[PDB]
Amino acid sequence: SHMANKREPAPGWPIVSGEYVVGNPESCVGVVTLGSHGLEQACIDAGAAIAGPCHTENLGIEKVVANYISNPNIRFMILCGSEVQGHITGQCFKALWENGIGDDGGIIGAKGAIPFLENVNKEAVERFRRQIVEVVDLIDCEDIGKITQAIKECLSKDPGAIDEDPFIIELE
């Protein structure tokens, strides 16, 4: 029963190049599709701000964190698609949000092979953790019908942008 407040993303958003499709930049929902193919367009059509795969539990996670915190409008992350064996990227991303990172850049509680953030610092991680108000765990789910329902549920709960400027973290 509300009109959610909105902010301008960083100029050029998404600034970090990668494998994703861009949607409505004022959408409050981002979607990570892990190891699956073919889910991205449907997520954008459902209303996502951005949707794309995430293969590695280091660089992959950094590019997602960097492109979400440069857009204050994004308040939800949906994790869906097949888990990556060895990388276990979905579990690593959940652990980042739940626990943060160590002094060494290691994701606390992560089960993947190389869960280290070399470029994304403690301040950027804490911005990610207060900007994203909820992580929706649909890990290993490839039902586009369920995933789109999750997207619309988030959109109906839009709490508006975080009241901070875009956060710019430089990657490699």
Author numbering: -1 to 170
From the primary publication:
Primary structure analysis predicts MtrC, MtrD and MtrE as integral membrane proteins with at least six transmembrane helices, MtrA, MtrB, MtrF and MtrG as peripheral proteins with one transmembrane helix anchor, and MtrH as a peripheral protein without a membrane anchor. Membrane-associated MtrA devoid of the C-terminal transmembrane helix was over-produced in Escherichia coli 20 years ago in a soluble but cobalamin-free form, and the holoenzyme was reconstituted by unfolding and refolding in the presence of cobalamin11. However, cobalamin appears to bind less tightly to isolated MtrA than to MtrA in the MtrA–H complex. The structure of cytoplasmic MtrA complexed with cobalamin and the structure of the soluble domain of MtrA without cobalamin were essentially identical. This finding suggested that the MtrA structures observed in this work were relaxed forms.
In the methanogenic pathway from H2 and CO2, the membrane-spanning methyl-tetrahydromethanopterin (CH3-H4MPT):coenzyme M (CoM-SH) methyltransferase complex (MtrA–H) catalyses the exergonic methyl transfer from CH3-H4MPT to CoM-SH (ΔG°′ = −30 kJ/mol) coupled with endergonic sodium-ion gradient formation. The only prosthetic group required for catalysis is vitamin B12 (cobalamin) bound to MtrA. Here, we report on the X-ray structures of the B12-binding domain of membrane-associated MtrA from Methanocaldococcus jannaschii and of the MtrA homologue from M. fervidus in complex with cobalamin. Analyses of these structures reveal a cobalamin-binding site that differs from other B12-binding proteins in an unexpected manner and also provides initial hints of how the energy of cobalt demethylation is transformed into conformational energy used for the ultimate sodium-ion translocation process.
